[PDB]
Nucleic acid binder design. Structure first.
Ligand SMILES: Nc1ncnc2c1ncn2[C@H]1C[C@H](O)[C@@H](COP(=O)(O)OP(=O)(O)OP(=O)(O)O)O1
Ligand SMILES: [Mg+2]
Ligand SMILES: [Mg+2]
Lengths: 393, 538
DNA sequence: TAATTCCCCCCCTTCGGTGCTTTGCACCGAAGGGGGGGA
């Protein structure tokens, strides 16, 4: 529906292309020949000064390749929520990206959707294409098919006004409160309805509290480890004094010396435990500000993450345990954790988060495409300094 | 002749008119050659005479053409380049002979007058006007404009590359069993056919090229081995680089050092063991590129070793997709590494080195990971796959490093090879306090105005020592206090600090640094037997 | 003098950004300079 126009003052994407492997190159060439043959893309020349990267991914249990375009710089330069999806037994995601390849794109705008395919050993200069139809990945592409979308799943929606469906990018999140053998049947009926006309469990999500250590005997080192935690926790939870636990930390003593706890200190410790078992009060979601997601590595295939909009005001805290590449591959686990966090964030709030990845840049850019299996790409930045003692979470 | 290929439409940036730069006085020997070349081009129709209806002008000049008695005519189009719209380049790298495969027949071809065979957009021809000044003095000057792609313009190479690809595609469609490498106008053709049937295919390719207005003169048509291609000499079963000549002088300037370092870097792709760090350190702090630089003793040794390395004939081999890629890494010390990529023992596909220093503080494991990543990326461009690594690090060392590191890191399929020196970590910090050792509560503060500070400590037994400092910042007194604790203690020691900066530096287990204080602390940490570091809020 | 353009690599230097609290010190990342190679 004639997308038209970029953001005022912006120019367009000018991102270079990263090298690929032989299998990805072969798959991309095979896909692009067929795509050009059907009029979806057209060859262009060097007079177009815009470019975006592309690559390929093999979807799980399908034994076929899919082509992905990094349309992240185009989205930020382009001009122009169901709060019941989190409370749902079973939620399924379906691919509806193949629908966009029938609506043509505006003649004025298709110059911005340019990409280049490299060659092995630089035997030939790269081949360039541009899109003639709506592409998969752009933020303005689903916002055009939306008016036509409001009418496709209506013969399935008004029949049962209990199922909640919400669309992000090329993905359809559908949720009900049916049994795992009947929700699947309803999803199959939806699949059939889609075919003729042209498994998540959100209720098992919980926050991760902050736990103070429990012990019978406390050394000077143990008390020092605790006061350093209470001082940091006082930022999130105003009202913690931690002024009697530091009174028995006066003077120079051996780190392994046992200090008996004063009853006043015991009362203070119990009260501070009590003020740590309750949720933080005074945190709300601002729809205008952006989300930030921090990830910390805990070892033995364990990771922790925090989602917040303002510092010390956490919207969500969680922990991820490994299942693939067990204590053998770290980039694989980090990629899976990033995908899981992004999926969780789209179901709530609605905006994808910006990640503070605890990795070096070069290794991530080298190996992240070998395990990615989603169709969206969140924006991310890399941290370099050690975060902290990292035992807060 | 001129190709019948379509022209690429180009335009100027909004608000810009066009160059009007006058021509600088040219020398007579250059003027005569320019006049002759222009007369021939006008006879062939590559340039057009222009009159008083064109207000634009741009200076022209000429240079010599490699190993020939001919001239190359160039135009200084810097202003037009400034006002010309932006392009996207399509050349993304250079082919490498190690990525080639063994073929039974090979031919190398070159196109004569490459740029002058591609037309230029008609509406853009008025901005390319130039004038050829008269010999000494006579006429005001003959003014021309370009009908084809000029040499010196920012858009010519991409246009020519795209046009050449467009021309070549139909022939490659009908002959999928013939390998063609194209770089600008240079063509390498390889086939598994007999020589008699290879010559006929080459003649058909030449006729196809001629039908599009591109000529391939017999002077630059190579038919017998060895073949000169992209700076390499290709033989039926091996390849090598064209001869590399190193300057041999007694007085060295900064420019000579720069050129020698560049030549050694170029030669390090097939000759194993090239080191340039000792020569490269001399470039720091120097300003003028004509200043005599006295060679040190660590640089003369490097030069003598590299000179001996290049005295032996060294060749590579071609790629065999039916076998495995093996990359073996060795350490040379002082943050330098070498690597060899091969498929069969003692037959290198290629060699290389890595000597980048990233970060203020590092150890041997991080540099090894960086080298592995660089080799992985390079092997994907040339061969499209990742090789098997032979690393001089024990599996237990890597296992105990990557599990306790706060970042995420990985190394592809690799196995340990026992070749000294090995990679290892030189000290480890205790996870629990040591029972029966001093505590050493240290502290250090400084004043930001007078830039003065102090760094002291105190222990549980009762020992104290205070040392005033000068010309130090706030985050240096903490390191000095930690060093004081490490110095005035025994072999096993607990340490309690108030600073996260020093603790974060120390916990990464560095062994080299750009700071002398950190280098002192590293040696004091290696010296001790059991160390525990603890942090406490102020 | 002496004059040009595009691409790949290496090595050294400046300045901007960030962000921890230390409001400017310390660390990192891009762009620019020099050199090599190709056309
Ligand atoms: N120094 C240079 N400046 C600008 N363009 C150049 C330069 N060297 C080469 N090129 C470009 C323009 C040439 O037409 C093209 C091919 O180079 P080359 O084959 O050496 O010359 P050529 O094809 O013009 O003449 P020849 O008849 O000798 O082959 O590369
Ligand atoms: Mg040539
Ligand atoms: Mg030529």
């Amino acid at each position: 529906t004639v997308p038209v126009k970029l953001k005022p003052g912006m120019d367009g994407p000018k991102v270079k292309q990263w090298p690929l492997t032989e299998e990805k190159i072969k798959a991309l060439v095979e896909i692009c020949t067929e795509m050009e043959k059907e009029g979806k893309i057209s060859k262009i020349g060097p007079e177009n000064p815009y470019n975006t990267p592309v690559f390929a991914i093999k979807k799980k249990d399908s034994t076929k390749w899919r082509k992905l375009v990094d349309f992240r710089e185009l989205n930020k330069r382009t001009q122009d929520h169901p709060a019941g999806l989190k409370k749902k037994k079973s939620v399924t995601v379906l691919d509806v990206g193949d629908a966009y390849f029938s609506v043509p794109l505006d003649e004025d705008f298709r110059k911005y959707t340019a990409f280049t395919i490299p060659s092995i050993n630089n035997e030939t200069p790269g081949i360039r294409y541009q899109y003639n139809v709506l592409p998969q990945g752009w933020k303005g592409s689903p916002a055009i098919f939306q008016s036509s979308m409001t009418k496709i799943l209506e013969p399935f929606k008004k029949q049962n006004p209990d199922i909640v469906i919400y669309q992000y990018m090329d993905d359809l999140y559908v949720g009900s409160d049916l049994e795992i053998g009947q929700h699947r049947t309803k999803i199959e009926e939806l699949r059939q309805h889609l075919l003729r006309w042209g498994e998540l469990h959100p209720d098992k999500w919980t926050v991760q509290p902050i736990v103070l250590p429990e012990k019978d005997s406390w050394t000077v080192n143990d008390i020092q480890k605790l006061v350093g935690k209470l001082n940091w926790a006082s930022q999130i939870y105003p009202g913690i004094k931690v002024r009697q636990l530091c009174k028995l930390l006066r003077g120079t003593k051996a780190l392994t010396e046992v200090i008996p706890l004063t009853e006043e200190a015991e009362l203070e410790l119990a009260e501070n435990r009590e003020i740590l078992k309750e949720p933080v009060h005074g945190v709300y979601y601002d729809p205008s500000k952006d989300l930030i997601a921090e990830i910390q590595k805990q070892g033995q295939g364990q990771w922790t993450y925090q989602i917040y909009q303002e510092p010390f005001k956490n919207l969500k805290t969680g922990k991820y345990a490994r299942m693939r590449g067990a204590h053998t591959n770290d980039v694989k686990q980090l990629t899976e954790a990033v995908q899981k966090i992004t999926t969780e964030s789209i179901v709530i709030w609605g905006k994808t988060p910006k990640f503070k990845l605890p990795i070096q840049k070069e290794t991530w850019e080298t190996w992240w495409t070998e395990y990615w299996q989603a169709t969206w790409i969140p924006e991310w930045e890399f941290v370099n300094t050690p975060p902290l003692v990292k035992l807060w979470y | 002749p001129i190709s019948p290929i379509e022209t690429v439409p180009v335009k100027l940036k909004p608000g810009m008119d066009g160059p009007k730069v006058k021509q600088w006085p040219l020398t007579e020997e250059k003027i005569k050659a320019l006049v002759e070349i222009c007369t021939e081009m006008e006879k062939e129709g590559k340039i057009s005479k222009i009159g008083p209806e064109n207000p634009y002008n741009t200076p022209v000049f000429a240079i010599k053409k490699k190993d020939s008695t001919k001239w190359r005519k160039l135009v200084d189009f810097r202003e037009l380049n400034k006002r010309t719209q932006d392009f996207w380049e399509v050349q993304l790298g250079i082919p490498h002979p190690a990525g080639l495969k063994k073929k039974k027949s090979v031919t190398v071809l070159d196109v004569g007058d490459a740029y002058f065979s591609v037309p230029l957009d008609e509406d853009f021809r008025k901005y390319t006007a130039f004038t050829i000044p008269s010999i000494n003095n006579e006429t005001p000057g003959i003014r021309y404009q370009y009908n084809v792609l000029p040499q010196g313009w920012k858009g010519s190479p991409a246009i020519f590359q795209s046009s050449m690809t467009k021309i070549l595609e139909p022939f490659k469609k009908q002959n999928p069993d013939i390998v063609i490498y194209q770089y600008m106008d240079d063509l390498y053709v390889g086939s598994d056919l007999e020589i008699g049937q290879h010559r006929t295919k080459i003649e058909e390719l030449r006729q196809h090229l001629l039908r599009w207005g591109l000529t391939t003169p017999d002077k630059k048509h190579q038919k017998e081995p060895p073949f000169l291609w992209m700076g390499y000499e290709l033989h039926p079963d091996k390849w090598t680089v064209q001869p590399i000549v190193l300057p041999e002088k007694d007085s060295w300037t900064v420019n000579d050092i720069c050129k020698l370092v560049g030549k050694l870097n170029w030669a390090s792709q097939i000759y194993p063991g090239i080191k340039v760090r000792q020569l490269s350190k001399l470039l720091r702090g120097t300003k003028a590129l004509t200043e005599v630089i006295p060679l040190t003793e660590e640089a003369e040794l490097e030069l003598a070793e590299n000179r001996e390395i290049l005295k032996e004939p060294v060749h590579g081999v071609y790629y065999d997709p039916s076998k495995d890629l093996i990359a073996e890494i060795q350490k040379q010390g002082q943050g330098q590494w070498t690597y060899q990529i091969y498929q069969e023992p003692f037959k290198n596909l290629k060699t290389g080195k890595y000597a980048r220093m990233r970060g203020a503080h590092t150890n041997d494991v991080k540099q090894l990971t960086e080298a592995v990543q660089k080799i992985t990326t390079e092997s994907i461009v040339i061969w499209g796959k990742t090789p098997k690594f032979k690393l001089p690090i024990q599996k237990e060392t890597w296992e105990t490093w990557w599990t306790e590191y706060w970042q995420a890191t990985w190394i592809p399929e690799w196995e340990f090879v026992n070749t000294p020196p090995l990679v290892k970590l030189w000290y480890q910090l205790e996870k629990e306090p040591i029972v029966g050792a001093e505590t050493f509560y240290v502290d250090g503060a400084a004043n930001r105005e007078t830039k003065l500070g102090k760094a002291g400590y105190v222990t549980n037994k009762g020992r104290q020592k205070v040392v005033p400092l000068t010309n130090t910042t706030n985050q240096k007194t903490e390191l000095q206090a930690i060093y004081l604790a490490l110095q005035d203690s025994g072999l096993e020691v607990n340490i309690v600090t108030n600073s996260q900066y020093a603790l974060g530096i120390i916990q990464a287990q560095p062994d080299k640094s750009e700071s002398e204080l950190v280098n002192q602390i590293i040696e004091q940490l290696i010296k001790k037997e059991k160390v525990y570091l603890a942090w406490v809020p102020a």
